[PDB]
């Protein structure tokens, strides 16, 4: 693939350019998964993380105090401060109004913050068409969405077939449907897309570290054609330092890049 | 497959017994899909189609006033009233505490107060250990699971075989998950299995879908929309559903 400067220049999203411009910038295709319960350790959390990141995903489900003053505004500051962007875990998986009003209503409203959000396939192109109105009727920023196309959890059902399947609803709209969230390069250069390739489930294989040897490494990962490491207690859980482990991944992520 | 009845007493999971032996008193196998924007509706076509009902489902994310004190009490009033179940529409998609918390937490504390619940078994046998851990810790009522076996919405990639795979996570718990949301008989009879087949878009026509292995009918806005007469089609689409129920061959 091109470079991200390169990607960054030419692509069609403009979620995606400024997501591929920040990794340039910031030297990093790291991306961290906090899911925890309070919204004060999420916050000490992304401040820590800020500088080391390209993106952050948030879990707005699991927090047992959130609040658009409380837990948004700072989110977004953190988000400009730090340079980047905001993506909720939230699976979307309907379509139509109902897909829409969970998108952008709720307590949470959505799409009021995250730059990107991500979408189970199974139901079809609807939750695509239904999301991309959501957000031009919601906000004037951009947003946009990843396709869960391969997942990790055990016995998921994402198998090649449903996998293509996914792969041909994110080409209804090369616009807004910025990639994926998968643990392999999904092609689509021949016919000129540009998806983005988020892969979650990803280690250092540190010493003595049973756990963590249970994922895939960095250097695997990068090497088969993710774009971005999804990291996530690995940065921060048994008393881990998030800034020190922020720059371990970055690190190791950059470096894998830019071996490839 | 056995009458309503004798599925009654003997399926293994207790919110799918009371389902069944509501389904033969009250002689229905219609369920009433209600997504409408405020309680007030709600509230008003539930009183209209409750005695023709065996389930109601409810779509509490697109409700603009949701709120337990407004909208579930009376709600759980009518289904004790009238006697029928509690089915949110939620297509919950996820494993683990994220699963959990979207069942059991937030504003709708969907887990307090619904009967039963569905999920897309795309992520895996975790979403029924999730869901089914959580409603243990939530409450000791019945509480049951279906999987979207296959889907009905355009492009959906609920083919063969992610159905199959579904069955197959079905499976896994013939405590909890109670049957799927699906369009054809899904089997399961020879391993032991009895699953309730609910299936929505009929208006397919009744004698059709029941004709084919459907369980239970799910009509939605066949029932109130277009100016139609909430009490006079609940009893339509009831007495058509009861009918082809009639006159399919029962076990013997």
């Known amino acids: ?8 220049a030419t692509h069609p999203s403009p979620v995606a350019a400024k997501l591929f411009n920040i990794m340039h910038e910031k030297q990093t ?8 319960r309070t919204t004060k350790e999420l916050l000490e959390l992304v401040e820590a993380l800020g500088p080391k990141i390209c993106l952050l995903k948030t879990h707005v489900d699991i927090l047992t105090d959130f609040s658009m003053e409380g837990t948004v505004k700072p989110l977004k500051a953190l988000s400009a401060k730090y340079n980047f962007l905001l993506f909720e875990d939230r699976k979307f998986a ?4 109902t897909v829409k009003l969970q998108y952008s209503a709720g307590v949470y409203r959505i799409a009021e913050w995250a730059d990107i959000t991500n979408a189970h396939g199974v139901v079809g192109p609807g939750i695509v068409s239904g999301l991309k109105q959501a957000a031009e009727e919601v906000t004037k920023e951009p947003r946009g969405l990843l396709m869960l196309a391969e997942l990790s959890c055990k016995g998921s059902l994402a198998t ?3 996998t293509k399947g996914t792969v041909d609803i994110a080409k209804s709209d090369k616009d807004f449907v910025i990639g994926f969230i998968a643990q392999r390069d999904m092609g689509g250069r ?8 988020m892969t979650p489930g990803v280690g250092l294989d540190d010493k003595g570290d049973a756990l963590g ?5 960095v250097d695997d990962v990068v090497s088969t054609g993710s774009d971005i490491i999804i990291v996530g207690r690995g940065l921060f859980a048994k ?4 800034k020190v ?10 470096e894998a890049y830019l071996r490839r």
Do not use: H, M, P
Request: hydrophobic residues 25%; negative net charge.
């Open 160 to 162: 090649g077939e449903y």
């Open 190 to 197: 021949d016919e000129g897309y540009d998806w983005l390739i």
């Open 213 to 217: 040897q249970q994922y895939r490494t």
């Open 1 to 8: 693939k091109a470079t991200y400067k390169e990607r960054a």
């Open 245 to 254: 482990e922020g720059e371990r991944y970055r690190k190791a992520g950059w």
């Open 94 to 97: 309907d379509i139509g109004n």
């Open 29 to 36: 295709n790291l991306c961290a998964s906090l899911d925890v």
């Open 239 to 242: 008393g881990r330092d998030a």
